[PDB]
Design a protein around this ligand. Sequence first.
Ligand SMILES: [Mg+2]
Ligand SMILES: [Mg+2]
Ligand SMILES: [Mg+2]
Ligand SMILES: [Mg+2]
Ligand SMILES: [Mg+2]
Ligand SMILES: [Zn+2]
Lengths: 191, 143, 52, 172, 137
Amino acid sequence: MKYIQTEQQIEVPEGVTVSIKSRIVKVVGPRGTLTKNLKHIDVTFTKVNNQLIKVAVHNGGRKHVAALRTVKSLVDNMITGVTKGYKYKMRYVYAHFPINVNIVEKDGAKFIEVRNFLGDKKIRNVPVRDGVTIEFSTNVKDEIVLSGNSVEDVSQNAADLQQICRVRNKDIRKFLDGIYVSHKGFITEDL
Amino acid sequence: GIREKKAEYFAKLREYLEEYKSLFVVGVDNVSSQQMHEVRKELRGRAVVLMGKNTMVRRAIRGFLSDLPDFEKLLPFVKGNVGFVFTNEPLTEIKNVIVSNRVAAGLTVVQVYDNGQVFPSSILDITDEELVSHFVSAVSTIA
Amino acid sequence: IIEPSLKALASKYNCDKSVCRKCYARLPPRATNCRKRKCGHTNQLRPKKKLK
Amino acid sequence: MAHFKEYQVIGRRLPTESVPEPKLFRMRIFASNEVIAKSRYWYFLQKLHKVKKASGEIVSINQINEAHPTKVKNFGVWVRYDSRSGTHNMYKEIRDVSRVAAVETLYQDMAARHRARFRSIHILKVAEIEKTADVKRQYVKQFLTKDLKFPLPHRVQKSTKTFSYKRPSTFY
Amino acid sequence: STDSIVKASNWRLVEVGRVVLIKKGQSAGKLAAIVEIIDQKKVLIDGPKAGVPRQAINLGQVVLTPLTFALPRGARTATVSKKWAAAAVCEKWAASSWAKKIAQRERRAALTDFERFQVMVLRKQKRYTVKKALAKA
RNA sequence: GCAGUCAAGCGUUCAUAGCGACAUUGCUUUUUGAUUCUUCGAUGUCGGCUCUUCCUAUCAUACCGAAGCAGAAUUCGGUAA
RNA sequence: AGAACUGGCGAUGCGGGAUGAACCGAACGUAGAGUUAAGGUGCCGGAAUACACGCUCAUCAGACACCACAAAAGGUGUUAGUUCAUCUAAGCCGGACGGUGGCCAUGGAAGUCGGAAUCCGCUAAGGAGUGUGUAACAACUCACCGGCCGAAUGAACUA
Ligand SMILES: [Mg+2]
Ligand SMILES: [Mg+2]
Ligand SMILES: [Mg+2]
Ligand SMILES: [Mg+2]
Ligand SMILES: [Mg+2]
Ligand SMILES: [Zn+2]
């Protein structure tokens, strides 16, 4: 119906500094620094103090207003990513052919490389996104762990790794092999 | 009504304040299906226990600002879910009879009501040993 | 083979889903409407069927 | 049906030796000229009393001017209307400076949202709403809050000439 | 840097006491004050001093200025005047480039042909002394 | 000829995996009728051969979603000419 | 295909409907000036890229009588409305449970195959162990669970 103003709030924690100019947001904390282009949405930022920045839409309809919270969130996860950080964990799941997973490189590149999936002679490769760093748990069998400042980049890189193992022409309720996201959370602050 | 029903809780509660002298507020946070309740008939020659929906429970309190203001000190312990033992004496023995029903791991008390006080409860008078040797202990320390 | 808990893990992906009855989309298991425009966002959904 | 004026129309059945002095009835009618208003008077009277204008007469027709044409009021508007598939009653609210101003937006709004032309609507009641927050409708309540202000982002100025020697801005 | 920096668009607000410059109509050219907001598109204005009649107006025929003064909402014409005066609104306006350019442009337009001629001759004089300067440092 | 809506029923159980009665809305113009507008100082019948192009309501082939998909085989469905 | 009344076409140009026997406007000597009709005024093209309030975003939008088609049925798209119910005594996060496998049937049969009822009741939670491990112990962990909560809220509908 057009909402004359409508706004959301972004808590800035100690140690971080968010600066925004023509909707290009730069967020900096202990972990690092992320940036994101928000030009595709007409929203207006406003800094109340260094703990708190507001975002409004003026005279906006439903779909516009829906953009508001989502901007808040994206900017929230920038702040979390650069303080606590992001960590997604995965598990290899296979009934028979063990899924054999390593890091390999070409032109100093870095790929997650997957071998023997359902007994496949083919090799699967997934580029490791910049900023995201891969580990392998020491004390959980078949674990794989992606982490970094960017939920976006961690989460997509995990998605890439699971999508590459899909199982074609088999009943996928019986043939459940894959690499799946098993937990997702923060780098710092327990697990 | 449901504001009749809101009021209803208010109505009876006030009445129970005005029907007992002591009150034990026993915490009834968590804990649920069949057990304790059925012991309480047996223990209802001493008390009324009432379980109920919280915002409602709180607003009852608001309606009792009129008098008996000492129940205000119950207020910081309204939190979660608590339940009543409307009561006369013992608050440290009878109480323990009420408490005993079969533990879970203490079923389940975590707060006390003692007429403006909030004991363990376990100490209230047993020898007048805080009134003949501790109402004159700095009279003892200095005559 | 495959510990109960990983079979469960695999199932959040492979089988705990619902299905559009007009267009067949694999949909979230608690969904009310199909996300697809071709079937008119129908709310005619069914659970994906469980193995034997 | 245009830029509206509001009229008192007062009419009656023609006198009979049997009933000289027949009862007088009034309607407030919104219309643009008085020929329409009297038409409208009869249209409604015929749906409410046995009378055709051939058996009646119009006794008085008088424009009713807004009393406080610069106090801002919130109006409750009651309306009956026809859709392509039935007929409906409907309550809406309008914020304005005059009934006549309100009624005109009522008609534009019935046209925009429900595709109701004028022939299809009856104004049932129109009333200043006395106490704020007897106001029921969000899209008018919004304006009633204390120290209300808003910007008007993205200003487009109309240009007088076809070419311009600078890239414009929307700055307000 | 190390403070969070956020430049925020500093829009002229539609608000009671906001002063506006009327683009169109008969009160075209004059200042009035917003007295009460009607909706996202209309407001009650009132320009007692410029003699623009208190009326409901569409925001599109008005242009918001940076000036605003204290005015209770709904204020009738009499107290609008008292307040506008108390505030010294015309003073502030006159002092602006905006108002000055309007005046400039108005004065140019009234120039006689003889006057246009003198401006030429004077310009040519100023020019001259300028070009020798712009040539020395 | 082809496609829907409702869902009683089929489908061990289970309306809708695959189907689907009573009814009911449509679409198509390679069926057949109905009409008689054009052509009876003329528009050369059927089938085949040859050759190009177009449609898609898709038989095969590419990638998918369903299943009463364990595997193999199939079947329903999408983007596809 | 066939009748009724009127008006048309045929016998008729003109202006509009791009086009077009029959629609809209208007019927016609040769011309000048003015004004209009029906229809139009982004550009093709004469005429406001006029003013005003809304509504609409279509990976198949839509765009003007006759007219150059679309329906049943659906949509948590977005708009405005209706009715019922909650609320100063929108709405959100957890409480939805025992006597009595009660009384007919029959692994079970409870509200929970099936038959007929569903009466009363009361206000507070550790599975002889989920797994590792041992033939069996030990240790850690979780089940009628939520903090609820803050001038609107829930449901069903209309177009
Ligand atoms: Mg009329
Ligand atoms: Mg009539
Ligand atoms: Mg009708
Ligand atoms: Mg009517
Ligand atoms: Mg029509
Ligand atoms: Zn679908």
